[PDB]
Design a binder for this molecule. Structure first.
Ligand code: PEE
Ligand code: PEE
Ligand code: PEE
Ligand code: PEE
Lengths: 308, 324, 88, 84, 50
């Protein structure tokens, strides 16, 4: 269960990605509709009004429709949902990239596993009561496991760099999406002026067309812009939390003040970053883990077991 | 999972109303995407951009092609159909999504979700503990049941030290309830004020004379009365979703939910040392009482130091038997 | 609805009065569609238009009534309690 | 007779659980009242449904004579619609 | 496993060859001279493949 390492920003971005995927699917389903553009020629040949006889068949009208759809309608208004689909697929793929790496997942599972072993161990509350038979043996075994974890994960820094990389990729993708979508959202217009040269096939050269779902695609584009804006603000806060304080080091000095143990050291690198992650999840876990990190506390446990 | 005990009757009712409103949104959206149109006929005789409305009967000849009719329909659907009659299902879908997010925000927000999961897990394991039956019955004890009861007692102490200092769950539930009534008021106002604009007869004046030959057209919006029905039904459901939510606000403000007293339990049961709890512990026990008060009773024995002493004494009788 | 106009009328009522030839109404397809829409909205009975929706509403209320005590927490907790103890 | 110890304590604990469940439930009759109300609602709803549905079933006719006064738009006043 | 990989790469090569060669034949404007003059009155037509 990796949910303990998913902060509020990650969950929020995942739900925004789901919403954007829904928007893209709905837009594609709207694009499925056959009747897309409706074109009438220009300068066609109490008051009683009479209709203008354009003198065109239904097939001529359909030919004009497809010609003006291909050669007069902007490509954004025709391929916006597919771009949304591609962008949301990229967002979903690059939002789990820290989680689904081979070497990173094992470290994550090891950290959360021994941290849960802490959060369920009697020796943690026993150690707080010490500060303030079988369980002792399990305590000693878990303490050897904690030392094994220290020698096993603390060396590397793949997790922090990988998370920074995926956050930066999210930020730059958000910037590109916002820029180009805000630039091209003005091209989703209802009334279009089509000037294809099919005078030899139909008889007319200038047509006025209406894109029937241009209003719907404009609303979808604005909603997608709002969703991407929220996603990018969330990713910018993620970057700010990543770089406003050094996440490559974690100080246990708060536990040093709270817990009477001062042998508790300040771990670094991936240990530090995952401690910050679980602090975003639940700050009690790190405080309870600290009493297992220190080795003078291990000597005290050894003495207690020796006397017992 | 087992979060059904954390959802009182009002939350279940609001969830089901949200499901029905989502059904309304999907149905209306499918209809608006597939069959929503206007059937516009030009007004032959016009009187200052208004229809004049004037041997056997013979049909009026408008001389329009089918595509001119389609163009007129599209233009008078975009420019003269009211925005409510066009974007009602999407507004309903947005409102339902916000309502569902507000109702299920604290189940996804990590700080509150961790506390809720901890509470539900310890309460389920406490309610299913045989030590609860033994203590409320007031030496035979299974060994594994012995250290199970001891470890669960220690876990209850752990949880009380871990949750009782904070009130994030209560504040989040308050804010969710406040948003779910503010949005209900706004929805009811803007939906009742604009439902009358969903009409079947729409008179459009769009100035496409250079392409069609007529200025003013009379249009029929076929899926309007149905949209007048669904909206009305929606205005019904939201009203219910309001009233229920308002009751929740009353339930959260008639008394202080950040203080829970076990006075009845220590009145009935023998263990009178059971203390009073505060903050998120109190609010979550109130939520549990909204489902089944007995779940509180079997929890209370795990909050008492007299029960701890009795459990310690009986366990000490058990493992240190007379033969060894 | 598929509405054809009555050529012969008598006070807003259809009068109903060598080779046969078709009756020419001089109506466009869109005039026919407008006539269908207006007579469907105004002259088709509301039951013939909203029978399935009323049936759906009635079934939803029937199923809510049948499964209310399984969902209402006060009764659902007691029912789960009784089912558990009786099955054990 | 013979009695596995787990079976014996489970039997005694389930006896005490029967007593506790009894004193928990026997005081109230909420389930019976709710079932009563559900059956009453389901029978009065059946009465209303059969009434208004038998009364209005004759209105589902294939041929409907419509008179809508759109003569200024169509040229005809009365039409004979077919409802497939 | 070796045979599966070899088939998956040789079919990849054939797919790329025939798909890249014929991808330019998906055109919007297509002239058709189908000789149905006895049924339509015209021999040549200018279709648009949407
Ligand atoms: C592996 C092989 C897969 C192929 C299997 C095909 C499955 C379906 C085949 C049967 C289709 C039945 C219809 C055939 C005749 C078409 C009839 C027709 O022209 O109807 C029109 C109608 C379009 O309406 P317009 O007139 O434009 O409406 C405008 C006013 N709103 O055409 C249709 O779309 C046919 C409707 C049948 C639905 C079948 C599925 C349609 C395609 C759904 C695609 C949705 C995918 C969205 C996700 C994409 C991105 C992830
Ligand atoms: C990185 C950021 C990318 C920036 C923008 C990317 C696209 C560049 C656009 C290039 C361009 O303008 O070329 C036009 C060019 C062709 O346009 P015409 O219609 O000829 O133009 C008419 C002139 N008005 O448009 C495009 O190529 C559109 C861009 C790609 C659109 C679709 C991309 C993905 C396509 C695959 C869809 C997958 C869906 C699968 C469905 C699954 C259902 C089961
Ligand atoms: C006994 C209980 C009675 C139930 C309701 C009775 C309603 C009787 C109304 C009588 C009346 O005057 O109706 C008129 C009025 C409007 O009539 P028009 O068609 O404009 O008039 C035709 C001109 N002759 O009709 C109505 O209001 C009928 C409305 C019936 C309710 C419709 C159903 C409401 C709920 C819809 C459910 C939608 C859910 C969709 C599910 C989505 C799943 C994916
Ligand atoms: C209280 C808050 C009210 C919220 C609604 C705002 C409505 C403001 C109305 C502004 C307005 O009328 O603007 C016109 C304008 C139309 O302009 P034209 O047709 O050019 O103008 C016609 C000339 N008379 O209408 C609007 O802007 C309507 C605005 C409401 C938009 C509704 C929002 C819908 C959002 C779409 C997303 C839906 C996604 C669904 C996902 C599906 C997944 C399965």
């Amino acid at each position: 269960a990796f949910r303990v390492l998913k902060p509020w920003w990650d969950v929020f971005t995942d739900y925004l990605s789901v919403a954007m995927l829904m928007i893209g699917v709905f837009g594609c389903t709207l694009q499925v509709m056959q009747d897309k553009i409706i074109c009438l020629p220009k300068r066609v040949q109490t008051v009683e009004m009479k209709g203008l006889k354009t003198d065109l068949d239904l097939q001529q009208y359909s030919f004009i429709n497809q010609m003006c759809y291909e050669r007069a309608l902007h490509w954004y208004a025709k391929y916006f949902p597919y771009l949304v689909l591609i962008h949301t697929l990229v967002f979903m793929l690059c939002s789990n990239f820290w989680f689904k790496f081979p070497g990173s997942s094992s470290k994550i599972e090891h950290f959360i596993s021994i941290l849960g072993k802490c959060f369920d161990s009697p020796w943690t509350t026993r150690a707080l009561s010490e500060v303030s038979k079988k369980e002792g043996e399990q305590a000693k075994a878990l303490f050897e496991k904690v030392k094994k974890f220290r020698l096993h994960v603390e060396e590397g820094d793949i997790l922090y760099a990988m998370y920074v990389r995926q956050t930066v990729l999210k930020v730059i993708k958000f910037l590109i999406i916002i820029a180009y979508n805000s630039a091209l959202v003005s091209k989703v217009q209802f009334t279009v002026d089509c000037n294809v040269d099919i005078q030899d096939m139909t008889g007319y050269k200038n047509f006025s067309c209406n894109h029937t779902m241009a209003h719907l695609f404009s609303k979808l584009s604005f909603c997608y812009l709002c969703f991407v804006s929220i996603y990018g603000l969330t990713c910018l806060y993620t970057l700010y939390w990543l770089f406003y304080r050094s996440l490559r080091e974690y100080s246990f000095e708060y536990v040093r003040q709270e817990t009477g143990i001062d042998d508790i050291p300040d771990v670094k690198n991936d240990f530090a970053f995952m401690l910050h992650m679980i602090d975003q999840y639940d700050p009690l876990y790190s405080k309870r883990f600290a009493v297992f990190l220190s080795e003078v506390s291990e000597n005290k446990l050894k003495q207690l077991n020796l006397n017992n | 999972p087992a979060y059904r005990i954390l959802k009182p009757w009002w939350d279940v009712f609001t969830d089901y109303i949200s499901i029905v409103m989502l059904m309304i949104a999907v149905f209306g959206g499918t209809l608006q995407v597939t069959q929503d149109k206007m059937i516009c006929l030009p007004c032959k005789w016009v009187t200052k951009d208004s229809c004049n409305d004037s041997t056997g009967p013979t049909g009026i000849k408008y001389d329009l092609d089918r595509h001119q009719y389609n163009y007129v329909d599209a233009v008078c659907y975009e420019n003269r159909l009211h925005w409510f009659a066009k974007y009602f299902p999407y507004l309903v879908l947005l409102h339902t999504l916000i309502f569902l997010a507000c109702s299920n925000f604290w189940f996804k927000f990590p700080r509150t979700s961790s506390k809720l999961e901890h509470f539900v897990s310890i309460l389920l394991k406490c309610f299913d503990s045989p030590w609860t039956t033994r203590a409320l019955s007031e030496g035979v004890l299974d060994k594994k049941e012995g250290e199970q009861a001891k470890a669960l007692f220690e876990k209850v102490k752990k949880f009380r030290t871990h949750v009782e200092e904070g009130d994030i769950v209560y504040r989040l539930y308050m804010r969710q309830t406040i948003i779910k009534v503010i949005k209900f008021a706004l929805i009811i106002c803007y939906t009742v004020y604009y439902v009358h604009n969903i009409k079947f007869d729409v008179d459009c004046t769009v100035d496409i004379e250079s392409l069609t030959g007529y200025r003013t057209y009379r249009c029929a919006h076929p899926l309007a009365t149905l949209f007048k029905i669904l909206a009305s039904f929606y205005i019904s459901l939201v009203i219910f979703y309001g009233l229920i939510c308002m009751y929740t606000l009353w339930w959260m403000l008639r008394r202080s939910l950040k203080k829970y007293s076990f006075e009845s339990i220590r009145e009935e049961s023998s263990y009178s040392d059971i203390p009073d709890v505060k903050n998120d512990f109190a609010f979550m026990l109130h939520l549990i009482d909204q489902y089944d008060p007995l779940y509180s009773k079997r929890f209370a024995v795990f909050l008492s130091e007299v029960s701890e002493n009795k459990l310690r004494q009986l366990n000490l009788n058990n493992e240190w038997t007379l033969d060894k």
